[PDB]
Design a binder for this molecule. Structure first.
Ligand SMILES: *[C@@H]1O[C@H](CO[C@@H]2O[C@@H](C)[C@@H](O)[C@@H](O)[C@@H]2O)[C@@H](O[C@@H]2O[C@H](CO)[C@@H](O[C@@H]3O[C@H](CO[C@H]4O[C@H](CO)[C@@H](O)[C@H](O)[C@@H]4O[C@@H]4O[C@H](CO)[C@@H](O[C@@H]5O[C@H](CO)[C@H](O)[C@H](O)[C@H]5O)[C@H](O)[C@H]4NC(C)=O)[C@@H](O)[C@H](O[C@H]4O[C@H](CO)[C@@H](O)[C@H](O)[C@@H]4O[C@@H]4O[C@H](CO)[C@@H](O)[C@H](O)[C@H]4NC(C)=O)[C@@H]3O)[C@H](O)[C@H]2NC(C)=O)[C@H](O)[C@H]1NC(C)=O
Ligand SMILES: *[C@@H]1O[C@H](CO[C@@H]2O[C@@H](C)[C@@H](O)[C@@H](O)[C@@H]2O)[C@@H](O[C@@H]2O[C@H](CO)[C@@H](O[C@@H]3O[C@H](CO[C@H]4O[C@H](CO)[C@@H](O)[C@H](O)[C@@H]4O[C@@H]4O[C@H](CO)[C@@H](O[C@@H]5O[C@H](CO)[C@H](O)[C@H](O)[C@H]5O)[C@H](O)[C@H]4NC(C)=O)[C@@H](O)[C@H](O[C@H]4O[C@H](CO)[C@@H](O)[C@H](O)[C@@H]4O[C@@H]4O[C@H](CO)[C@@H](O)[C@H](O)[C@H]4NC(C)=O)[C@@H]3O)[C@H](O)[C@H]2NC(C)=O)[C@H](O)[C@H]1NC(C)=O
Lengths: 209, 209
């Protein structure tokens, strides 16, 4: 009956020692008749108990969305440990077990390059600065924008795309007021990946050279 | 279980350059031995055309047939978003299979180019890769190439146009040269052909600086 989905820790969260990474176990199609879900967490086959039990969410299709969240400790997710979730419920003949771990294989650093505003864009009220992040592995990556030491949160980063070479590429687009770009303000592009030095790289772009 | 039709578009280079002749191809597969009669009808925006060359049937390795019809386009016709139909008729199918293609409708957007040099892992091996990121273009119809000192470099690979949240398209292109050629100081160019561009062309260069 119910379906189980196991989600990895937010890429930013696994890369900064100053964050709360957590694996997430989601159970959709839980009956209004048998709502209880017992969760069992395993870490490299060893049962852990620290999991956080989250209150069920009534979905509009008259079913519940039960979730459990196990916090990971950085040095474990990046070090390829296997996080197993065992979902037990009355409406299941036998428990559902799901497993997640970071993608194995040679870590490859991303390469960044920037795109200043377009020929048409520069005639509009708002302009867009873009970032191209190519050839990183695994797809676990954080793309943020910041200007003058302050977070610039009006951007859209595309989801990682696989290449014929076996690595990923994405595109980030920050949209800002034309007036700000013309004033020669300097906007940067932050990329976080396990293969970068100090897990981070940044690429600035302005009206100036 | 019957015959199958696939309708192919003219190459982006043929459509926006005085290079070769642009054609729209209609490929029919699974043509049975007992039902060989394949009738091809062509419609440019509703208007049936007879300037259609059908390549005599080809005996496939799995013992089927591959019948292909070719229609030549009057260059500007594809770019002007003219719709092409292929009504394939066969005895083996209950009713004719009609497939319709045209250049993607909606206002065009210019590609933005970005060059990336070799990475840390690349400059260790005998060969180095030089990437080229292209984004923001619409329609997907694009032609990416490489050339150095004027001669085309043909050991490259380009990803298919990926779709952005903002309905624009993007791709990355990777050229694999010899470390010695990059190291020598030689300059490599990324040639991007698209209708939204001025003179349907833009280049982007990189060298060892
Ligand atoms: C009743 O309705 C519910 C809900 O309705 C839904 O929502 C409403 C609003 C409508 O839009 C409606 O149409 C929707 O249906 C139904 O529930 C849905 O059920 C389906 C399956 O039946 C689920 O589909 C899977 O989605 C996965 C991705 O889910 C994410 O993205 C969607 C869409 O963006 C979101 O809605 C989800 O919430 C998920 O988002 C993630 O959520 C996490 C937890 O909140 C986040 O993680 C945490 O984030 C926090 C911060 O908030 C911290 O930072 C933590 O550290 C961090 O862990 C996470 O960030 C967030 N991400 C995003 C992007 O937002 C898919 O991956 C999955 O794919 C598989 O599906 C098929 C399974 O066989 C199949 O197609 C494939 O196999 C496919 O691929 C698998 O997965 C991976 C792929 O990489 C690979 O391993 C394999 O290829 C393959 N493996 C396996 C073993 O399968 C599904 O498509 C859907 O998520 C779910 N919705 C919700 C809300 O949970 C319900 O089904 C309906 N009932 C009935 C009877 O049908
Ligand atoms: C028995 O054999 C036959 C023959 O097969 C061949 O021989 C056997 C022995 C094997 O070796 C086999 O590998 C060989 O292919 C079998 O027939 C095959 O059947 C499958 C389907 O079952 C066909 O698959 C589709 O292919 C499309 C792409 O085809 C190109 O690529 C293949 C390689 O994979 C080539 O072999 C083809 O020749 C095609 O190549 C293109 O050909 C054009 C015409 O020649 C070229 O254009 C012209 O070029 C000249 C220069 O030469 C000029 O420049 C002109 O200007 C120019 O027009 C073009 O260059 C060339 N391109 C390339 C890339 O090479 C796929 O597109 C298609 O996928 C779509 O459809 C799927 C469903 O079928 C769908 O799931 C996908 O998502 C996808 O997209 C969707 O499609 C649907 C419609 O189908 C749409 O509604 C959707 O909108 C659409 N979505 C999107 C987002 O677009 C298929 O994968 C296969 O091609 C065919 N073989 C051949 C040779 O045609 C038969 O199956 C066997 N029997 C059995 C029992 O299996």
């Amino acid at each position: 009956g119910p379906s189980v989905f196991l989600f990895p820790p937010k890429p930013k969260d696994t890369l900064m020692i100053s964050r709360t990474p957590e694996v997430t176990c989601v159970v959709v199609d839980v009956s209004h008749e048998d709502p209880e879900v017992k969760f069992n967490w395993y870490v490299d086959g060893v049962e852990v108990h620290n999991a956080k039990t989250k209150p069920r969410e009534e979905q509009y299709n008259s079913t519940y969305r039960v979730v459990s969240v196990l916090t990971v400790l950085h040095q474990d997710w990046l070090n390829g440990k296997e996080y197993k979730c065992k979902v037990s419920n009355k409406a299941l003949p036998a428990p559902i077990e799901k497993t997640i771990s970071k993608a194995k294989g040679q870590p490859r650093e991303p390469q960044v390059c920037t795109l200043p505003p377009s020929r048409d864009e520069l005639t509009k009220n708002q302009v867009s600065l873009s970032c191209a992040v190519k050839g990183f592995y695994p797809s676990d990556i954080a793309v943020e924008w910041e200007s003058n030491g302050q977070p610039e949160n009006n951007y859209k980063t595309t989801p990682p795309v696989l290449d014929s070479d076996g690595s990923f590429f994405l595109v980030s687009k920050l949209t800002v007021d034309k007036s700000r770009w013309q004033q020669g303000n300097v906007f940067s592009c932050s990329v976080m990946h396990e293969a970068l030095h100090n897990h981070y790289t940044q690429k600035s772009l302005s009206l100036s050279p």
